[PDB]
Amino acid sequence: PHTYNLRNKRALKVLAQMRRLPFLSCLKDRQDFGFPLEKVDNQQIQKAQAIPVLRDLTQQTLNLFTSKASSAAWNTTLLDSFCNDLHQQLNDLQTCPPLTQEDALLAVRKYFHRITVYLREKKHSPCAWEVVRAEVWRALSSSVNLLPR
């Protein structure tokens, strides 16, 4: 609960630094992605079941930002930092309305698929990448709501 928070702080700091475009540059590309955990309380999914969901979320985020398209869209030093942070998060997690755990996992999958399809359909424009970066930032910030303190 504690270490996930700390390294997620660092991940969010770097992901905010990765922004290249001024705010409000990409209005015509904005897109509701329907992140499935935006309103998911800790009463809904407990510690035993939140950890797999967080693990899959971290894994899919790492996969997204370690693609070749990502290497072409973002500063390489910041990418190194962000990807390393996500991977450390993954190692920590592996060391150990959506309702159940399986529903959460499947919904997270479809959400990252919507992100992939959006980027393809937008031909990886800088604005599409910025829309995705801000979306992932909000998802990562929301996700900490599934851990107790």
What is the structure about, briefly put?
The protein has 149 residues and is mainly alpha-helical. Helices cover 67% and strands 0% of the residues.
Count of the domains:
1
Helix content: 55-70%
SSE ordering = HHHHHH
Q: C-alpha Rg, in Å?
A: 15 Å
Taking the alpha carbons of the first and last residues, their distance comes to 6 Å
Number of helices: 6
**Count of extended strands:** 0
Describe the global form. Answer: globular
Structural class label: mainly alpha
What's the story with the biggest beta sheet? Answer: none
The portion of residues forming beta strands comes to under 5%
PDB class: cytokine
Keywords: Interferon, Immune system, Mouse, cytokine
Assembly: monomeric
Entry title: Crystal structure of mouse interferon alpha2 at 2.1 angstrom resolution
Describe this structure as you would to a colleague:
Belongs to the alpha/beta interferon family. Its main location: secreted. The protein is mainly α. The protein has one domain. Helices cover 67% and strands 0% of the residues. The chain has helices at 2-17, 47-65, 68-73, 76-95, 101-121, 126-143.
